[PDB]
Amino acid sequence: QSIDQLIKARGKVYFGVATDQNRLTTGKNAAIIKADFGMVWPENSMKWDATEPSQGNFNFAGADYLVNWAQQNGKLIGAGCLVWHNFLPSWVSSITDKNTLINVMKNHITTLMTRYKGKIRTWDVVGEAFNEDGSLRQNVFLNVIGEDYIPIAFQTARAADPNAKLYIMDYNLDSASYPKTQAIVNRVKQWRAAGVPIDGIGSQMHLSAGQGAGVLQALPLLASAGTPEVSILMLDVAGASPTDYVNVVNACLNVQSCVGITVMGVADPDSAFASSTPLLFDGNFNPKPAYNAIVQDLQQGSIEG
Numbered sequence: 001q002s003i004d005q006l007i008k009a010r011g012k013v014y015f016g017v018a019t020d021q022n023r024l025t026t027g028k029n030a031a032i033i034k035a036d037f038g039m040v041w042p043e044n045s046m047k048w049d050a051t052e053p054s055q056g057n058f059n060f061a062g063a064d065y066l067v068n069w070a071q072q073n074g075k076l077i078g079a080g081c082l083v084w085h086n087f088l089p090s091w092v093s094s095i096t097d098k099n100t101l102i103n104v105m106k107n108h109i110t111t112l113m114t115r116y117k118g119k120i121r122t123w124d125v126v127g128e129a130f131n132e133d134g135s136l137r138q139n140v141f142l143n144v145i146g147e148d149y150i151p152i153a154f155q156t157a158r159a160a161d162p163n164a165k166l167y168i169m170d171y172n173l174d175s176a177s178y179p180k181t182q183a184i185v186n187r188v189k190q191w192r193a194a195g196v197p198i199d200g201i202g203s204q205m206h207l208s209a210g211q212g213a214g215v216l217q218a219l220p221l222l223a224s225a226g227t228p229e230v231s232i233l234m235l236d237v238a239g240a241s242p243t244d245y246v247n248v249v250n251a252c253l254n255v256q257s258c259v260g261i262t263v264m265g266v267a268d269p270d271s272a273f274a275s276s277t278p279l280l281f282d283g284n285f286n287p288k289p290a291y292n293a294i295v296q297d298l299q300q301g302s303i304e305g
């Protein structure tokens with residue numbers, strides 16, 4: 001059974017997966033994605049160091065392949081991350097002039113979003129902007145531009161493609177009592193109050209065993225920022241326990257504004273954390289216990305009021 005179909009039947013938008021051209025042309029990835037997933041994200045091909053490796057020199061072959069494959073196969077597309085300290089070329093992080101960095105950031109945003117205008121459901125505009133203690137991360141953007149870089153990025157994105165849902169994403173938002181979780185909620189509330197167009201918070205859920213249960217409290221806390229959407233991104237779970245995975249899925253189901261879940265890949269050998277066997281399919285492309293547990297969970301209705 002298809003977990004995407006099953007989650008749609010429970011009123012959600014999608015169950016998605018990260019992929020790219022290499023995956024689609026090897027293994028059984030394309031067959032599994034066609035059958036079982038409803039949204040794709042580029043694993044690597046939309047990163048800044050993939051797409052703009054030197055100034056104004058855009059590389060779109062990989063991203064184009066994924067977007068076209070998704071279109072041809074009737075899948076939604078998410079993409080990102082546009083402004084991120086990760087995977088950022090040294091030509092960017094060496095800029096010291098404020099107006100230059102502002103325009104470099106804006107052109108990166110606008111060029112990527114314009115190319116795919118109208119085709120992308122969700123853009124992750126700003127990623128990993130917070131320190132663990134909840135203060136803003138001192139990346140090049142914060143150091144050179146200051147905290148206005150976040151509002152500027154979102155407004156620029158809204159202008160470039162008003163159809164897209166614009167997200168901020170971060171990791172270690174998996175515990176309701178952790179400082180980072182409350183801090184992103186607080187900052188997003190105040191950005192939105194000031195007119196900054198943040199449509200979603202995406203929680204990047206690279207989990208260790210046993211962390212699924214806590215998401216049942218963290219995800220509702222994230223939703224309390226009042227964004228129209230929240231989502232689960234980059235999901236994998238060390239050990240791939242059915243209990244962890246079912247708890248994450250149920251957190252999504254419990255949170256009205258949660259639109260869906262994206263897993264970080266299809267099969268274990270293709271994970272960056274392969275030795276932790278953290279995905280839903282094994283090295284034979286058979287569904288693992290966790291996949292089947294999710295299927296059982298989604299088939300079984302809850303008693304609603």
Ligand SMILES: O=[N+]([O-])c1ccc2nn[nH]c2c1
Pocket residue numbers: 017018041042043044079080081124169232233234235262263264
């Ligand atoms: O959910 N995802 O797996 C995922 C992968 C790569 C991304 N880049 N920006 N957002 C992303 C989400």
